[PDB]
Amino acid sequence: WTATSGSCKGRCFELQEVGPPDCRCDNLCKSYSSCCHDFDELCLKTARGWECTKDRCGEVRNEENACHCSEDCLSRGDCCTNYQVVCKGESHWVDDDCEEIKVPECPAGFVRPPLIIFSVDGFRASYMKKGSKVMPNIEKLRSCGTHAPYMRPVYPTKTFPNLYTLATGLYPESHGIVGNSMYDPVFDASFHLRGREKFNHRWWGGQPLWITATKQGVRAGTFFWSVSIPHERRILTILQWLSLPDNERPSVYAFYSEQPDFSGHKYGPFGPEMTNPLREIDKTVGQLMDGLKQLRLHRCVNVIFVGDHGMEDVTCDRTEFLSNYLTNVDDITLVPGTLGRIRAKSINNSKYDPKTIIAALTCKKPDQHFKPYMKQHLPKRLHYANNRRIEDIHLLVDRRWHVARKPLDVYKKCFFQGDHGFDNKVNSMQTVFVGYGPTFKYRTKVPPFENIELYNVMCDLLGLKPAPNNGTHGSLNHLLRTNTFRPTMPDEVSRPNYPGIMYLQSEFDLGCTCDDKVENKLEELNKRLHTKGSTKERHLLYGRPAVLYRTSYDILYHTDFESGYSEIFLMPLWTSYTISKQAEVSSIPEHLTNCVRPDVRVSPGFSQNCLAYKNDKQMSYGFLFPPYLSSSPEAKYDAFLVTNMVPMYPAFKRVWAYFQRVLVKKYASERNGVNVISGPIFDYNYDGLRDTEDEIKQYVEGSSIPVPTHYYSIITSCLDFTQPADKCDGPLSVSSFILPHRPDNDESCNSSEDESKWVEELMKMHTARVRDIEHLTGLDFYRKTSRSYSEILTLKTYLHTYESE
Numbered sequence: 001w002t003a004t005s006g007s008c009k010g011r012c013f014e015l016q017e018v019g020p021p022d023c024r025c026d027n028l029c030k031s032y033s034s035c036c037h038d039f040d041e042l043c044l045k046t047a048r049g050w051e052c053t054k055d056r057c058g059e060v061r062n063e064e065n066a067c068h069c070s071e072d073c074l075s076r077g078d079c080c081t082n083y084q085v086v087c088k089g090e091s092h093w094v095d096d097d098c099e100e101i102k103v104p105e106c107p108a109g110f111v112r113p114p115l116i117i118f119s120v121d122g123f124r125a126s127y128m129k130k131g132s133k134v135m136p137n138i139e140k141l142r143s144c145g146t147h148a149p150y151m152r153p154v155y156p157t158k159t160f161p162n163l164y165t166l167a168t169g170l171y172p173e174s175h176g177i178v179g180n181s182m183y184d185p186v187f188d189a190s191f192h193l194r195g196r197e198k199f200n201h202r203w204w205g206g207q208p209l210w211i212t213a214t215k216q217g218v219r220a221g222t223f224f225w226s227v228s229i230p231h232e233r234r235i236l237t238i239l240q241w242l243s244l245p246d247n248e249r250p251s252v253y254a255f256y257s258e259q260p261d262f263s264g265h266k267y268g269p270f271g272p273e274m275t276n277p278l279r280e281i282d283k284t285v286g287q288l289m290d291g292l293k294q295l296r297l298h299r300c301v302n303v304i305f306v307g308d309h310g311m312e313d314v315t316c317d318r319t320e321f322l323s324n325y326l327t328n329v330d331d332i333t334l335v336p337g338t339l340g341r342i343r344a345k346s347i348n349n350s351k352y353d354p355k356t357i358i359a360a361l362t363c364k365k366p367d368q369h370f371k372p373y374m375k376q377h378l379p380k381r382l383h384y385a386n387n388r389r390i391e392d393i394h395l396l397v398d399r400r401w402h403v404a405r406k407p408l409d410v411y412k413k414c415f416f417q418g419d420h421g422f423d424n425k426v427n428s429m430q431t432v433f434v435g436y437g438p439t440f441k442y443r444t445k446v447p448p449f450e451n452i453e454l455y456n457v458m459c460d461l462l463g464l465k466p467a468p469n470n471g472t473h474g475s476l477n478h479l480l481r482t483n484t485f486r487p488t489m490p491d492e493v494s495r496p497n498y499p500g501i502m503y504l505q506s507e508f509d510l511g512c513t514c515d516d517k518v519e520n521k522l523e524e525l526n527k528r529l530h531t532k533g534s535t536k537e538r539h540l541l542y543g544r545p546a547v548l549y550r551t552s553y554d555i556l557y558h559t560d561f562e563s564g565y566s567e568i569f570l571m572p573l574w575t576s577y578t579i580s581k582q583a584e585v586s587s588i589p590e591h592l593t594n595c596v597r598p599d600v601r602v603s604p605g606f607s608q609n610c611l612a613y614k615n616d617k618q619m620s621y622g623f624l625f626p627p628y629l630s631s632s633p634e635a636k637y638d639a640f641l642v643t644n645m646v647p648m649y650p651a652f653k654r655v656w657a658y659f660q661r662v663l664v665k666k667y668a669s670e671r672n673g674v675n676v677i678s679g680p681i682f683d684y685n686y687d688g689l690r691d692t693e694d695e696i697k698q699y700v701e702g703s704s705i706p707v708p709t710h711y712y713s714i715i716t717s718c719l720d721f722t723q724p725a726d727k728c729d730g731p732l733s734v735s736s737f738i739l740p741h742r743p744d745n746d747e748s749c750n751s752s753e754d755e756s757k758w759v760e761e762l763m764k765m766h767t768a769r770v771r772d773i774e775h776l777t778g779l780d781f782y783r784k785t786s787r788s789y790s791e792i793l794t795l796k797t798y799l800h801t802y803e804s805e
């Protein structure tokens with residue numbers, strides 16, 4: 001109940017929302033059905049439209065007008081945005097040359113440059129170039145300020161998850177808004193775009209920027225506008241708020257536009273009908289900048305122009321139907337469209353079986369346009385699993401396609417030509433970022449970055465301490481002229497041991513054998529030097545990784561590689577080696593095919609054993625440093641040490657062997673040498689964070705050897721590839737992956753073919769940021785480079801995408 005008989009007199013777009021049954025006058029009252037009786041009359045004036053005309057100049061103030069052109073309007077803060085241009089001979093902001101804003105030029109009373117976030121729905125990255133002719137204001141912001149060629153959204157590339165990620169710095173799995181539609185089994189409640197459940201604060205986790213600001217004494221405009229409030233009125237309202245007295249005036253504001261998304265759904269991303277919506281958004285930007293210029297705020301305010309996601313061509317005819325795969329389609333609930341989420345229709349149906357649903361959906365049709373996954377098997381880069389609102393069964397849908405349950409859903413629920421929600425690596429899903437203002441750099445292009453990073457920067461812009469989030473604070477320092485955040489590297493928690501030779505061969509009873517007993521002083525001093533770290537500078541190029549948790553581990557040196565060997569997990573946490581462009585690939589000699597050798601530096605009690613692998617009929621083993629890349633026949637023996645062995649399903653060994661035999665050498669010739677760091681990951685609770693030992697769900701049979709859920713590699717070289725990886729003077733280049741350690745290759749539909757036809761495609765799907773690997777391992781890489789730390793943080797957030805240009 002709302003007693004709508006109160007009045008909005010002197011309260012129009014009030015900042016503190018009042019509680020029922022008192023009537024509301026705030027920018028959200030329409031959405032709640034709660035505005036006072038006179039809200040439209042008082043607050044949503046439209047008379048005479050939005051622009052001054054020559055004949056309105058110096059008019060007598062008429063309070064009925066949408067905006068004003070009377071002499072008193074500047075001090076009332078409610079002129080039409082074009083007032084000074086029509087009536088005082090001023091120029092539009094877009095018509096002025098740009099001039100560097102070296103310092104904030106703010107009116108007296110402003111304690112800090114205000115921040116205005118101008119968010120646009122569905123604004124695909126390529127619109128900046130393709131629509132440039134029709135967006136002069138946006139183009140001026142972009143060319144004069146700081147811009148990226150695109151900004152990566154989060155998955156799913158839908159509105160609610162992305163706008164709330166922008167506000168919180170959090171992955172959707174952590175903030176809880178995991179789609180536009182959701183079922184929470186604990187609440188037993190559904191969240192929908194339409195209706196009232198979505199207003200309940202229990203859906204919305206983390207701490208959004210407006211709450212962060214408020215808690216720290218920085219006032220915020222409200223970030224949500226009821227859909228029927230026209231854009232011109234939103235802008236006018238922001239500009240009025242900016243004329244409040246110092247003690248009442250917010251420092252942070254948001255504008256949101258439903259366009260171009262609204263039209264993009266109807267006409268497709270590049271439909272000829274899209275030109276007008278882009279012109280109209282540009283006009284809105286121009287109104288804001290002219291309004292800021294009138295208020296003398298145009299060289300004071302930091303403006304962020306940012307999109308939530310892009311838009312792809314999608315039509316009704318490109319729909320896969322689950323009824324073409326499943327016989328039991330009526331026993332499931334699907335969240336449909338550009339992604340699929342499946343659960344049981346009824347919790348009382350014990351006949352329902354996710355394993356058989358996944359199998360009926362796996363590689364069933366030659367050009368199948370979706371791929372089923374258990375959520376924990378989705379590419380780790382999506383960070384889309386650790387939330388009870390995310391169903392166990394997920395469908396990754398090919399770009400340009402939809403999935404639906406049955407054909408009747410698509411014609412009894414062609415309209416649309418555009419949609420979005422696909423994998424956030426897809427080019428059509430990328431969106432925009434421009435920052436303009438005293439705190440952003442002048443005419444500066446920055447590399448693409450992820451939207452999870454922006455919260456930290458918006459907090460920096462406002463002098464706020466960010467709440468804990470998924471950005472890497474400092475990785476966007478290069479966007480900013482000042483207010484940088486200067487982090488220090490995390491402290492190492494565990495120091496390594498450096499074991500020497502401590503055990504005789506006969507102390508080991510591991511069931512391992514090797515044909516290696518075949519007997520020099522010219523060469524004996526050499527092997528000793530190599531075991532003491534003499535080649536370490538070649539193979540450990542960026543210092544050893546730091547271990548950021550409490551554990552027992554040993555550094556092991558060898559001719560061709562260095563490792564940090566965990567006495568707790570019985571295998572390396574990391575293995576580091578450099579492969580030059582000149583390196584040769586050799587084979588594993590016949591006599592060494594099943595060779596595993598005790599490591600006399602490491603006790604039998606802290607070693608794996610070969611018998612466990614013999615006895616485990618499902619599990620085999622592989623090596624972290626590959627024997628194929630040994631530098632000499634003698635060095636090759638090191639690669640067969642029991643301390644370089646890791647457990648691997650045979651199906652995964654297909655993937656791993658091709659990576660190690662073929663791809664590493666390929667990358668070394670392409671990139672002019674690579675440094676490789678490889679290791680295991682254990683994430684049995686799919687939270688994106690390193691498991692402790694008591695979280696491990698699977699061991700090699702009859703042993704305490706834990707089975708990794710994933711294997712990673714970080715492949716680093718010189719950004720200037722005219723320099724070899726091991727003699728690089730400048731910035732680095734990186735690519736990484738986190739490969740799921742699976743007992744089948746069901747994910748890869750072409751896997752009965754030669755690894756040259758499917759392995760590299762698999763690895764590209766599982767591309768990763770170094771930062772993802774850090775979270776998953778508790779390691780901190782690139783500790784000793786000649787680069788600035790902020791630069792290394794940017795490098796750690798880099799994702800090599802494998803999308804065209």
Ligand SMILES: *[C@@H]1O[C@H](CO)[C@@H](O[C@@H]2O[C@H](CO)[C@@H](O[C@@H]3O[C@H](CO[C@H]4O[C@H](CO)[C@@H](O)[C@H](O[C@H]5O[C@H](CO)[C@@H](O)[C@H](O)[C@@H]5O[C@H]5O[C@H](CO)[C@@H](O)[C@H](O)[C@@H]5O)[C@@H]4O)[C@@H](O)[C@H](O[C@H]4O[C@H](CO)[C@@H](O)[C@H](O)[C@@H]4O[C@H]4O[C@H](CO)[C@@H](O)[C@H](O)[C@@H]4O)[C@@H]3O)[C@H](O)[C@H]2NC(C)=O)[C@H](O)[C@H]1NC(C)=O
Nearest residue numbers: 173174175176204205206386387388468469470687688775
């Ligand atoms: C991305 O960034 C984020 C933000 O930094 C990272 O997420 C953080 O990770 C932390 C480590 O997992 C985690 O810390 C835990 O907090 C528990 C208290 O949680 C509440 O309070 C905070 C603070 O305000 C709040 O943010 C939380 O909000 C979550 O939950 C609400 C309600 O469900 C949601 O609305 C909201 O969206 C958010 O949900 C997300 O996180 C939860 C987990 O907290 C997930 O379950 C959800 O799926 C969702 O993703 C909470 O309201 C605290 O109780 C924990 O302490 C336990 O563990 C310690 C180990 O130190 C142990 O010593 C304790 O004994 C304790 O264990 C006990 O409870 C166990 C479970 O019942 C039980 O098994 C034991 O036997 C013990 O009894 C823990 O410290 C922090 O909450 C989140 N924060 C957020 C916002 O998500 C995220 O990791 C980053 N991602 C990556 C990949 O890096």
Ligand SMILES: CN1CCC(NC(=O)c2ccc(Nc3ncc4c(n3)n(C)c(=O)n4Cc3ccccc3)cc2)CC1
Nearest residue numbers: 119159160163164166167193223224225254256262265
């Ligand atoms: C065919 N059509 C398809 C799309 C349909 N429409 C919708 O689904 C819709 C409507 C209105 C809004 N509005 C909205 N405004 C501000 C938001 C916000 N959502 N969220 C989630 C935030 O966090 N902030 C705060 C903020 C503001 C600015 C930046 C960051 C965060 C969203 C989506 C209509 C039909």
Ligand SMILES: Cn1c(=O)n(C)c2nc(Nc3ccc(Cl)cc3)ncc21
Nearest residue numbers: 447670671732733734735795798800
């Ligand atoms: C910050 N940064 C950047 O601007 N580029 C262009 C980068 N590229 C890479 N990696 C990379 C990897 C494989 C190949 Cl073949 C080429 C480049 N890492 C970091 C990068």
Ligand SMILES: [Ca+2]
Nearest residue numbers: 121122159308
């Ligand atoms: Ca959207």
Ligand SMILES: [Ca+2]
Nearest residue numbers: 683689690691
């Ligand atoms: Ca984990």
Ligand SMILES: [Cl-]
Nearest residue numbers: 178179180181
């Ligand atoms: Cl959804």
Ligand SMILES: [K+]
Nearest residue numbers: 613616619620
């Ligand atoms: K075996």
Ligand code: NA
Nearest residue numbers: 745746748751
């Ligand atoms: Na297969």
Ligand SMILES: [Zn+2]
Nearest residue numbers: 122261265420
């Ligand atoms: Zn949309």
